[PDB]
RNA sequence: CUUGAGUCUCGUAGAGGGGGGUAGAAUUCCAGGUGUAGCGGUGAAAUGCGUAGAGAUCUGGAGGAAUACCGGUGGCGAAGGCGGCCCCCUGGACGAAGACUGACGCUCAGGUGCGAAAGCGUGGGGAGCAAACAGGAUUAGAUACCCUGGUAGUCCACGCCGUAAACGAUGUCGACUUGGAGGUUGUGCCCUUGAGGCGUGGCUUCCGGAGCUAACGCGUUAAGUCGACCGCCUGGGGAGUACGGCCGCAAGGUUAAAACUCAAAUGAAUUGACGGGGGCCCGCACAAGCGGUGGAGCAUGUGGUUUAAUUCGAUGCAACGCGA
């Protein structure tokens, strides 16, 4: 994008709930174009989220998001002759994306004898501020001030 | 700028210290003509008068005294 | 021994060193300490941080007299001399005024031939 | 005879020259005062300086040399050159209005004088600076180079020397030939004069027309159009050297060849190279992402080695599941 940065495909909303953020979440969790496999795990995890952690599964989604979605990160740019770890605040979409990435990676770092249970437990701990995704929001807020 | 020609003094004498200290920095140094717009002839006369005054200790050479 | 509460400082500031010494309206010096008088050597002894530490170790070395204000005689363009003057500013001294006392000859003597490369 | 060239009267500007005073910064030194272990230097240190008290700082003194700001390719001078201030002696230029002399002019071989810096002689003086030298950093070797010192010299007097890219690389004098912008210095007239507007000189800077020039460029301050006189040049190198003369205390200067050798040497301009320089803009080049390779097993190619032969070619990107 040297000449003009181009935007992103406005993805089509979730068929089960008409929301577009859960659509981006299932796209993030998807692997090798296996969308059916992905949305199966996503729906399974949100259903049990609506049970083990109170009602409002679609609301518990952002209950975990706003708990993990960062505000500041570092963008090492050499505007002074060397890569300087300058901190920057993000637009909403950047923190949305980083939140969902951090959720799915932590879910994959759990085992829990299923990916449904993995994502469910991880998203619950994230919603009530427990686990590792919240910790990697803590570190991204910590090193954002270290320089 | 073209001051002494508007006034028409025949010679800027060294005694008129009152009219000198405005051609002098607070440090005591002479200010160039390109800043005060004085004509070069009267600039020379000013320089001579100022040096004579500095000698008579009417003006200071510098502030270091 | 005695009190002044408004002294005068002198930062003789070469490109190779920076010495700072204070007295009180009289030239009778009180406390001196050099950037080189603090283990530093080479280019290290010519840094504004060395100026910081020299300012500190003079202020404390004279604090027995407990001065509270300061004139500063900055002389010679040592590298980063605002450094030490504001170090002293923070050291508990309301600096009264600064004075560039860098001696300027009126073509008095022939200077040495400068570096050739 | 008065238009050239001069003289007189009134003024103006100026680092023009010579002499003598004097001032204030700063450097170094000395004297003490305050006040201790660093100062100074560098790539980093060392030599050096500092406990006999530095360095830093204050006061006093001594001494030498040079004159910040003004300051301007601004001014003056034949050129070299000339820079605080004051006085004394003195040269030149320019302007206004007259008066006076009446061609008294221009140029100039030889000649005479002046002539940056270095240098030489004699005697001074000597702060700073600094050839040479000394020492420290230091290799078959110390010279490089840098530091810390440092004499001559730099300064004064009086003698020599007489050379510089002493350059505007442009001899002096006169006349003539379109313009524009300045700087500086006069001076006349004038708007109500100050300011300001019209003039009219001298000097000086930069554009540019005709013209000129090989071109670059010069261009009323000519390298234009002419006149008078002088100096000088005749391929490059040998060589501004040898010999001789003259000059000088000396260093050397000046005048000035030939043998020999080359087929060029040179001037200006043109087009490219000259990337371990700039600037701009591109590309999955990076950034943001996703999946890999590098680890494991196997497939295949190459290198290597082995072999009787392991056919031959392809070898950075742009050879290596390539010819096949
Ligand atoms: Mg004179
Ligand atoms: Mg003095
Ligand atoms: Mg002392
Ligand atoms: Mg002249
Ligand atoms: Mg007659
Ligand atoms: Mg002659
Ligand atoms: Mg002579
Ligand atoms: Mg000489
Ligand atoms: Mg001599
Ligand atoms: Mg002698
Ligand atoms: Mg020396
Ligand atoms: Mg030396
Ligand atoms: Mg040596
Ligand atoms: Mg050398
Ligand atoms: Mg002489
Ligand atoms: Mg000659
Ligand atoms: Mg010259
Ligand atoms: Mg010549
Ligand atoms: Mg002529
Ligand atoms: Mg004129
Ligand atoms: Mg022209
Ligand atoms: Mg002209
Ligand atoms: Mg001519
Ligand atoms: Mg010609
Ligand atoms: Mg010949
Ligand atoms: Mg000769
Ligand atoms: Mg001879
Ligand atoms: Mg002889
Ligand atoms: Mg690529
Ligand atoms: Mg990348
Ligand atoms: Mg492998
Ligand atoms: Mg093969
Ligand atoms: Mg292939
Ligand atoms: Mg094959």
From TrEMBL, chain B:
<keyword id="KW-0687">Ribonucleoprotein</keyword>
<dbReference type="GO" id="GO:0070181">
    <property type="term" value="F:small ribosomal subunit rRNA binding"/>
</dbReference>
<comment type="function">
    <text>Binds as a heterodimer with protein bS6 to the central domain of the 16S rRNA, where it helps stabilize the platform of the 30S subunit.</text>
</comment>
<dbReference type="InterPro" id="IPR018275">
    <property type="entry name" value="Ribosomal_bS18_CS"/>
</dbReference>
<comment type="similarity">
    <text>Belongs to the bacterial ribosomal protein bS18 family.</text>
</comment>
<dbReference type="GO" id="GO:0000028">
    <property type="term" value="P:ribosomal small subunit assembly"/>
</dbReference>
<dbReference type="GO" id="GO:0003735">
    <property type="term" value="F:structural constituent of ribosome"/>
</dbReference>
<dbReference type="Pfam" id="PF01084">
    <property type="entry name" value="Ribosomal_S18"/>
</dbReference>
<dbReference type="GO" id="GO:0006412">
    <property type="term" value="P:translation"/>
</dbReference>
<dbReference type="InterPro" id="IPR001648">
    <property type="entry name" value="Ribosomal_bS18"/>
</dbReference>
<keyword id="KW-0689">Ribosomal protein</keyword>
<keyword id="KW-0694">RNA-binding</keyword>
<dbReference type="InterPro" id="IPR036870">
    <property type="entry name" value="Ribosomal_bS18_sf"/>
</dbReference>
<comment type="subunit">
    <text>Part of the 30S ribosomal subunit. Forms a tight heterodimer with protein bS6.</text>
</comment>
<protein>
    <recommendedName>
        <fullName>Small ribosomal subunit protein bS18</fullName>
    </recommendedName>
</protein>
<keyword id="KW-0699">rRNA-binding</keyword>
<dbReference type="GO" id="GO:0022627">
    <property type="term" value="C:cytosolic small ribosomal subunit"/>
</dbReference>
From TrEMBL, chain C:
<keyword id="KW-0694">RNA-binding</keyword>
<dbReference type="GO" id="GO:0022627">
    <property type="term" value="C:cytosolic small ribosomal subunit"/>
</dbReference>
<dbReference type="GO" id="GO:0000028">
    <property type="term" value="P:ribosomal small subunit assembly"/>
</dbReference>
<dbReference type="GO" id="GO:0003735">
    <property type="term" value="F:structural constituent of ribosome"/>
</dbReference>
<comment type="similarity">
    <text>Belongs to the universal ribosomal protein uS11 family.</text>
</comment>
<comment type="function">
    <text>Located on the platform of the 30S subunit, it bridges several disparate RNA helices of the 16S rRNA. Forms part of the Shine-Dalgarno cleft in the 70S ribosome.</text>
</comment>
<keyword id="KW-0687">Ribonucleoprotein</keyword>
<dbReference type="InterPro" id="IPR001971">
    <property type="entry name" value="Ribosomal_uS11"/>
</dbReference>
<dbReference type="GO" id="GO:0006412">
    <property type="term" value="P:translation"/>
</dbReference>
<protein>
    <recommendedName>
        <fullName>Small ribosomal subunit protein uS11</fullName>
    </recommendedName>
</protein>
<comment type="subunit">
    <text>Part of the 30S ribosomal subunit. Interacts with proteins S7 and S18. Binds to IF-3.</text>
</comment>
<dbReference type="GO" id="GO:0019843">
    <property type="term" value="F:rRNA binding"/>
</dbReference>
<keyword id="KW-0699">rRNA-binding</keyword>
<dbReference type="InterPro" id="IPR019981">
    <property type="entry name" value="Ribosomal_uS11_bac-type"/>
</dbReference>
<dbReference type="InterPro" id="IPR018102">
    <property type="entry name" value="Ribosomal_uS11_CS"/>
</dbReference>
<keyword id="KW-0689">Ribosomal protein</keyword>
<dbReference type="InterPro" id="IPR036967">
    <property type="entry name" value="Ribosomal_uS11_sf"/>
</dbReference>
<dbReference type="Pfam" id="PF00411">
    <property type="entry name" value="Ribosomal_S11"/>
</dbReference>
């Amino acid at each position: 994008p040297r000449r003009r940065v181009i935007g992103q495909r406005k993805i089509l909303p979730d068929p089960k709930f008409g929301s577009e953020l859960l659509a981006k979440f299932v796209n993030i969790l998807m692997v090798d174009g296996k969308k059916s496999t992905a949305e199966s795990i996503v729906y399974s995890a949100l259903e049990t989220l609506a049970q083990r952690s109170g009602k409002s599964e679609l609301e518990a989604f952002e209950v975990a998001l706003e708990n993990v979605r960062p505000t500041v990160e570092v963008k090492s740019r050499r505007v002074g002759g060397s890569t300087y770890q300058v901190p920057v605040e993000v637009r909403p979409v950047r923190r949305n994306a980083l939140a969902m990435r951090w959720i799915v990676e932590a879910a994959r770092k759990r085992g829990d004898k299923s990916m449904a249970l993995r994502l469910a437990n991880e998203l619950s701990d994230a919603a009530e501020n427990k686990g590792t995704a919240v910790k990697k929001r803590e570190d991204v807020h910590r090193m954002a001030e270290a320089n | 700028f073209c001051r002494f020609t508007a006034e028409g003094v025949q010679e800027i004498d060294y005694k008129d210290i009152a009219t000198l200290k405005n051609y002098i920095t607070e440090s005591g140094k002479i200010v160039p003509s390109r800043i005060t717009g004085t004509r070069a002839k009267y600039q020379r006369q000013l320089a001579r008068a100022i040096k004579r005054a500095r000698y008579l200790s009417l003006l200071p050479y510098t502030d270091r005294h | 021994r005695k009190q002044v509460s408004d002294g005068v400082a002198h930062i003789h500031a070469s490109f190779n060193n920076t010495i700072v010494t204070i007295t009180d309206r009289q030239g009778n010096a009180l406390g001196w300490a050099t950037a080189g008088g603090s283990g530093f050597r080479g280019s290290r002894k010519s840094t504004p941080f060395a100026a910081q530490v020299a300012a500190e170790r003079c202020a404390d070395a004279v604090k027995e007299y407990g001065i509270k204000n300061l004139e500063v005689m900055v002389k010679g363009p040592g590298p980063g001399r605002e450094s030490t003057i504001r170090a002293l500013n923070a050291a508990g001294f309301r600096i009264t005024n600064i004075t560039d006392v860098t001696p300027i000859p009126h073509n008095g003597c022939r200077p040495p031939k400068k570096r050739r490369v």
